[PDB]
Design a protein around this ligand. Structure first.
Ligand SMILES: C=CC1=C(C)/C(=C/c2[nH]c(/C=C3N=C(/C=C4\NC(=O)C(C)=C4C=C)C(C)=C\3CCC(=O)O)c(CCC(=O)O)c2C)NC1=O
Length: 214
């Protein structure tokens, strides 16, 4: 559907729904999340965002990504470092898990950023705007399900400090993404990569649930 954002929304409708219906995610949404479950999602995000930001930095000047380069408004690496220090302690870096599901997500991010940068937009869009859009709801759900201590740390990931209005930001981001010049072949691959992004998350949810039970 003409605008890239709309074509993405239509093509990923099924996989997006499946991501929401995935047991671990479905449960998180229903308020059924444990401290162990929550810590794993946080470790996962840390790995994903380290990888994504590394590739964004490498391709920030390229006309195939520049329009969507918003370093100050969206970077999450530092927020996640801050959160992990609280969830895993001062030695979090050497104690956080790094499972195969997380590894294959990181792997794809690096493949894209290194050889197919024109597809990096698909991951940035789905990861950043998805996290930005549902951050406030999952934050609250976690607050009452986790029963955190009043130490003012651990949930910075859910707050984008340099974005005053999420609604106006997403509008600017969408406009910038729709502004990208793409040949027919390029576009179809970006759409396919968007599906890939949702599928990597769905596989991650499956593994996290598996680790919790077993
Ligand atoms: C390409 C990126 C991408 C996909 C496919 C993803 C899907 C996705 N992320 C979600 C939220 C979420 N799911 C968890 C986390 C998990 N969720 C993850 O995508 C990852 C990688 C973890 C880590 C194990 C958290 C913390 C949120 C809220 C994200 C936020 O608002 O900061 C849910 C519901 C969000 C809502 O009520 O708030 C879905 C279906 N979101 C996206 O941004």
């Amino acid at each position: 559907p003409q605008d890239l954002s709309e074509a993405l929304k239509e093509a990923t409708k099924e996989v997006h729904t499946q991501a929401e219906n995935a047991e671990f995610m479905r449960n998180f949404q229903k308020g059924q999340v444990t401290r162990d479950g929550f810590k794993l999602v946080m470790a996962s995000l840390y790995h994903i965002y380290v990888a994504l930001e590394e590739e964004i930095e490498r391709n920030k000047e390229s006309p195939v990504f520049a329009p969507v380069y918003f370093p100050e408004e969206l970077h999450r690496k530092a927020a996640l470092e801050q959160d992990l220090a609280f969830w895993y302690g001062p030695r979090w870096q050497e104690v956080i898990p790094y499972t195969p599901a997380m590894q294959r997500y990181v792997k794809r991010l690096h493949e894209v950023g290194r050889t197919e940068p024109e597809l990096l937009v698909a991951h940035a869009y789905t990861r950043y705007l998805g996290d930005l859009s549902g951050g406030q709801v999952l934050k609250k759900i976690a607050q009452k399900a986790l029963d955190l201590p009043s130490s003012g740390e651990g949930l910075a990931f859910f707050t984008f400090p340099n974005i005053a209005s999420a609604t106006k930001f997403k509008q600017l981001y969408r406009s910038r993404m729709n502004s990208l010049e793409m040949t027919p072949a390029v576009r179809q691959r970006v759409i396919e990569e968007a599906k890939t992004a949702f599928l990597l998350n769905i596989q991650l949810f499956e593994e996290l649930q598996e680790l919790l039970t077993h």
